[PDB]
Design an enzyme around this catalytic site. Structure first.
Site, PDB file in Angstrom:
ATOM      1  CD  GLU A 151       8.125  -2.231  -6.870  1.00 35.43           C
ATOM      2  OE1 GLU A 151       8.346  -3.288  -6.230  1.00 35.43           O
ATOM      3  OE2 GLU A 151       8.990  -1.341  -7.053  1.00 35.43           O
ATOM      4  N   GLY A 166       1.454   2.737   3.877  1.00 38.16           N
ATOM      5  CA  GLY A 166       2.543   2.157   4.638  1.00 38.16           C
ATOM      6  C   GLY A 166       3.844   2.260   3.866  1.00 38.16           C
ATOM      7  N   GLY A 167       3.744   2.081   2.555  1.00 37.14           N
ATOM      8  CA  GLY A 167       4.915   2.150   1.708  1.00 37.14           C
ATOM      9  C   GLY A 167       5.603   3.488   1.785  1.00 37.14           C
ATOM     10  CB  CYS A 198       0.429  -4.888  -8.709  1.00 31.23           C
ATOM     11  SG  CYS A 198       1.342  -6.335  -9.408  1.00 31.23           S
ATOM     12  CB  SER A 216      -0.936   0.020   1.214  1.00 27.54           C
ATOM     13  OG  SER A 216      -0.208   0.185   2.424  1.00 27.54           O
TER      14      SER A 216
END
Ligand SMILES: NC(=O)c1ccc[n+]([C@@H]2O[C@H](COP(=O)([O-])OP(=O)(O)OC[C@H]3O[C@@H](n4cnc5c(N)ncnc54)[C@H](OP(=O)(O)O)[C@@H]3O)[C@@H](O)[C@H]2O)c1
Ligand SMILES: NC(=O)c1ccc[n+]([C@@H]2O[C@H](COP(=O)([O-])OP(=O)(O)OC[C@H]3O[C@@H](n4cnc5c(N)ncnc54)[C@H](OP(=O)(O)O)[C@@H]3O)[C@@H](O)[C@H]2O)c1
EC number: 1.2.1.4
Lengths: 504, 502
Positions: free
Chosen positions: A249, A229-230, A285, A226
């Site tokens: 990503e 959080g990423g 994705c 996500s």
């Protein structure tokens, strides 16, 4: 450890047998410290040795096929046929990097021919090559528990590069990860290499991932997940006393442009679309999340066919409770807006319904909250006034993994204008096909401008993925006996090398 | 508002007023730059290569003005500036060759396979393309080769990225002339002026607005760790983080074995010449020398000391750099565990300095590892080779790492190299780190703080890749693929097919 946790049965919501430890900063420090201790020896191994390790891991994985599939099936609800194919992908991916390493191409050996007699000052003997950054942290994807996780592309390319790896096991599939870790452990024993080359950590407390990303011995990070959080972990990686590369990503809506002539040439284009957006129950994705089309009868027929298909879709079981709830609340919330039409399939919670949204380009411009990705079997169609309207919209798209175009020769003039725009926002352009499939070869580019990736100048899939974990070092006037084999005058490794600007 | 350049020799203002640009001009420049980004990267390689060669030519045509002006703004001797102009011009030509070469495309293609089961293998091809407008902050110590038309600007333009330079306030007049040269080159090549824009100003808000502008897609920086890290952080807090390539500093550790001191009687002289070159204002200046506790080292230290005492007064680039140097050397010489030898000099001139301490004391003061920009260096006498290797394990990132030894030391040198590879971008054997060859194999940078992006180089042909990103093309028809990736390879460039060398 003080606590333990259990995996959640994707089909029932209840706990699955087998308890997993909840690791903390204590285990992070131990793992990182041990990893750092073997970093030097690991990158100095012969390419063939490290290549063999990758092939052995691939073999060990295949030997545990049954366990992996059975366990991953219950933890993720992904069908066995899909998991069987992912195991192969994962294994062949490891072999691909085995070839690359053995190849010696990753060294990118480059040398300048010295010139002792030049005036006013002589030209020195300079030679450079790539070497491993050091220990790398990896966060696997929940939607691809094998090919993008414990032994996925980040782990594989990092090991090939010569970097020890520490995986922060995803809490959505701990059992799957552990088995993979058992496989890698066996591979290391057979190859007679230090266990610290690969370490799997587990835990459902975010403090773990945060401590791992912030540990001074970690030198790079691979992440798939996500944007929220990423990006948070990315920021953590750059606030460190020593900033480290962060390859994550974070998401994309993979814009797809469909011209009228394409819809005429393929009567089943709508069917193809629905199949692409619902593959893996839409949990890809690269799922085509938004389709731009012209306001013609072809599009109306297209929309109607897709709608009818969507209504018939069987209930979908998503990856995690959390992913299910986000999907349910987001689709219901988006369908409530003005100017948007939504078609749902029949489904009772915990299962979710597939959805197809339809709106005009005007409303698309009005509701900027629509370009955001909604992870699940959902997609949106944007009907445009004309081609110029369509091109105008492409100028404002955010970064994406892919961008697709469906057209025939009569559209080439406009397609020619669209491509330069799509090149700027996507890592991979797909023509007259769908973005879902991702070929693990040499030319692949999986990533792209933010948010597709946090490092657009790289790829997380394909042979070039190995370079993310390497940095160059120049050697000036060193004697033959002290230069690394890759740079010795006689080229004992027989690798490709570029001399004074000439191709390797 | 306007501001004036400071005469490096007097501290007084030099004629010619320069504008103090703000976020207003930033937006205009960035907006215009973004508007021509696409057309610029789409130019034929030969056209962009020609532009680089024309800029080089225009620079050489204004040699006199540049040298005269830069000399008064920086106090750097004319002989040095004359050599830097050539370096700058040849550097531009180097990238002209690279672009014309088509190698920067890094064309790679997978051979399709329609008949494979269960699923067919698609036709995939990738190449590199420009990130977009790039912001550049030049170095104060290399006003030409690392500034307005320096390595970052040159490689960025070669890559196909428009460039916006935040003119360094230490040499505004020099920058302007260079900007006049680039402007002329663009007129002759009949290309948009927005391809290159020079901004000026002594208010930091300018650089901050430039680094934060959403149309800026990458940044090149050469300077202090403090400002450099601050701008780096700005670059990563943006809604869209952008690559930031900054060289922030280094102490360039140098290891000298006893046998090397015996083989070269004038090693101490060589050392002093390296640390005092450009009055010590080199990013690659050997700032710390580790040596063994032997008579050779004592003789070495004594020779260096004697030479240091004789050094003529030095005029640093600017007063700020001068004062930092004065207060830092006087402050460091104040620790009990450090001996210092100064040359004779009266302010505004500064004295050269040579510090001497033991490895024990070095371990007690981690701050001694910090760089002091100026004609000063430190010698650390070690108990033995093991002590020396132990110290190398704790070194911070550096641009270079040097080793002076003979065959009899190779066994220990063999252990040291793997350690130095990990902390430096370039290893130098039996020579000095100061010179930086602009070729194809160069690596100028390294682990933090040497660079904020160790996987790159700010000098050398590979510097062009910092401004490029890959794009994959799947199943596109020949007529829609970029020339670099067409089946017949009309550009005749090197390309890698299915893993085989290009
Ligand atoms: O897969 P997905 O779609 O569910 O995506 P996701 O929420 O981004 O999770 C991807 C991975 O990152 C971890 N993670 C996310 N943000 C985190 C944070 N800020 N601190 C530490 N760990 C973090 C997750 O930990 P969990 O396994 O704890 O979710 C998981 O292992
Ligand atoms: O050369 P040097 O050794 O004197 O090094 P330096 O202080 O790092 O200066 C290098 C360049 O960066 C600029 N700069 C430094 N930190 C800045 C900040 N935080 N915001 C905006 N601009 C910043 C300087 O502006 P000035 O020209 O204003 O110093 C100069 O153009």
């Amino acid at each position: 450890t003080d606590n333990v946790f259990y995996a959640t049965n994707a089909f029932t919501g209840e706990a699955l047998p087998l308890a997993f430890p909840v690791h903390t900063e204590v285990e992070v420090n131990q793992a990182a410290t041990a990893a750092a201790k073997v970093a030097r020896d690991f990158r100095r191994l012969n390419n063939s040795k490290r290549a063999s390790l990758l092939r052995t891991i691939a073999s060990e994985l295949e030997a545990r096929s049954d366990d992996i599939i059975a366990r991953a099936h219950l933890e993720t609800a992904l069908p066995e046929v899909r998991l069987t194919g992912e195991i192969a992908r994962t294994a062949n991916q490891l072999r691909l990097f085995a070839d690359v390493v053995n190849s010696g191409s990753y060294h990118q050996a480059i040398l300048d021919t010295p010139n002792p007699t030049r005036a006013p000052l002589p030209k020195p003997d300079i030679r450079r090559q790539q070497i491993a950054l050091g220990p790398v942290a990896v966060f696997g994807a929940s939607n691809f528990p094998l090919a993008f996780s414990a032994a996925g592309g980040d782990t594989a390319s990092a090991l090939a590069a010569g970097c020890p790896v520490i995986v922060k096991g995803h809490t959505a599939h701990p059992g799957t990860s552990q088995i993979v870790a058992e496989c890698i452990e066996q591979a290391l024993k057979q190859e007679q290499l230090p266990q610290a080359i690969f370490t799997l950590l587990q835990g459902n407390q975010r403090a773990l991932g945060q401590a791992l990303v912030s540990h001074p011995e970690i030198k790079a990070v691979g992440f798939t997940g996500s944007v929220g959080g990423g990006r948070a972990l990315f920021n953590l990686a750059h606030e460190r006393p020593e900033p480290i590369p962060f390859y994550g990503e974070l998401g994309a809506i993979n814009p797809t442009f469909i011209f009228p002539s394409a819809m005429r040439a393929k009567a089943d284009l709508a069917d193809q679309f629905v199949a692409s957006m619902t593959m893996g129950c839409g949990q890809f994705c690269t799922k085509p999340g938004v389709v731009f089309a012209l306001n013609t009868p072809e599009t109306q027929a297209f929309i109607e066919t897709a709608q009818s298909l969507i209504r018939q879709q069987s209930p979908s079981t998503l990856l995690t409770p959390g992913i299910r709830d986000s999907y349910q609340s987001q689709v219901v919330s988006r369908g409530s807006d003005d100017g948007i039409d939504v078609t749902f399939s029949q489904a009772e919670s915990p299962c979710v319904a597939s959805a197809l949204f339809v709106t005009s380009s005007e409303n698309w411009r009005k509701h900027p909250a629509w370009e955001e990705e909604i992870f699940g079997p959902q997609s949106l169609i944007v009907v445009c006034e004309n081609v110029a309207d369509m091109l105008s919209l492409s100028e404002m798209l955010a970064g994406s993994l892919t961008a697709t175009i469906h057209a025939t020769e009569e559209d080439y003039p406009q397609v020619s204008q669209l491509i330069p725009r799509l090149e700027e926002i996507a890592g991979r352009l797909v023509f007259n096909g769908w973005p879902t499939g991702v070929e693990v070869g040499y030319a692949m580019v999986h990533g792209g401008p933010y948010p597709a990736s946090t490092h657009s100048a790289s790829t997380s899939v394909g042979a070039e993925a190995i370079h993310r974990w390497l940095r160059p070092v120049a050697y000036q006037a060193l004697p033959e006996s002290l230069l690394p084999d890759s740079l010795k005058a006689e080229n004992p490794l027989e690798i490709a090398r570029a001399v004074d600007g000439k191709a390797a």
